[PDB]
Amino acid sequence: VNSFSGYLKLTDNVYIKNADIVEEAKKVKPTVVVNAANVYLKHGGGVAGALNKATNNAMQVESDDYIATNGPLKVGGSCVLSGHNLAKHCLHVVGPNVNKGEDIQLLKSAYENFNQHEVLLAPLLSAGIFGADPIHSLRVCVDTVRTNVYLAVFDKNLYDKLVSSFL
Ligand SMILES: CNC(=O)C[C@@H](C)Nc1ncnc2[nH]c3cc(Br)ccc3c12
């Protein structure tokens, strides 16, 4: 039993809700919140900009030190950093950005990072400003993640479409 509330169950291990991931993290304080990161950990907009804003820019300060030490992530890769006031940990995961020409096949590799964590609160990778089809992202999530994932979808119209079209 966990504290996630109001989710629709899609499969044995995947759950979904129309919710602002920032507000959801603040309420649940999950062990892991997933950020929709880029390779530079520049949290300017989309989910990343919103999560970082909620940390009062502490996420960005920590991220800049991480990059200065380690260099950029790989597309499809991840790193674990602090969750600040939102969660114990933040798993920064880089899905391919279609608006940069990146290989959509890398979306499966991106979701594989979730399997290193027993339970996660997450957005749909490569959705939103990353330009991928969210219906496809949900399909890859369900077919790749084996651990327990609670998906927050900000847009109500999109949430209803994802549920209604789910096979
Ligand atoms: C239409 N874009 C998506 O669907 C992409 C998806 C990854 N974005 C989000 N997903 C879940 N919760 C979220 N809260 C937010 C608050 C702010 Br401001 C900006 C974005 C999000 C956000």
* DSSP codes joined into one string, 5-26: -SPEE-SSSEEEEE--HHHHHH
- Give me the resolution in angstroms, 1 decimal: 1.0
Q: Identify the domain containing residue 93 by its residue range.
A: 8-163
Residue 3 within a domain: no
CA dist., res. 6 & res. 18, Å (int) = 9
| Token reading at 138 | 């949900």
Residue 124 near ligand 1, beta carbon < 6 Å: yes
| Residue found by looking up tokens 């990343």 in the block | 48
In a domain, 74, yes or no: yes
User: CATH code at 49?
Assistant: 3.40.220.10
> How many other CB atoms sit within 10 Å of the CB of residue 99?
10
Task: Round to whole Å and give the CA distance between 79 and 77.
Answer: 7
Which residues partner with 9 through β-bridges?
15
Burial class (CB in 10 A: 0-12, 13-18, 19+), 113: buried
Q: Is 51 in the pocket of ligand 1 (CB under 6 A)?
A: no
d(CA 91, CA 35) in angstroms, rounded, equals: 6
Calpha distance 32→101 (Å, rounded): 29
Domain count for the chain, please give it. 1
In a domain, 104, yes or no: yes
**Domain membership flag for residue 137:** yes
In a domain, 2, yes or no: no
Experimental method: X-ray
SS3 163: helix
**Rounded to an integer, what distance in angstroms lies between the CA atom of residue 164 and that of residue 1?**
27
130 assigned to some structural domain: yes
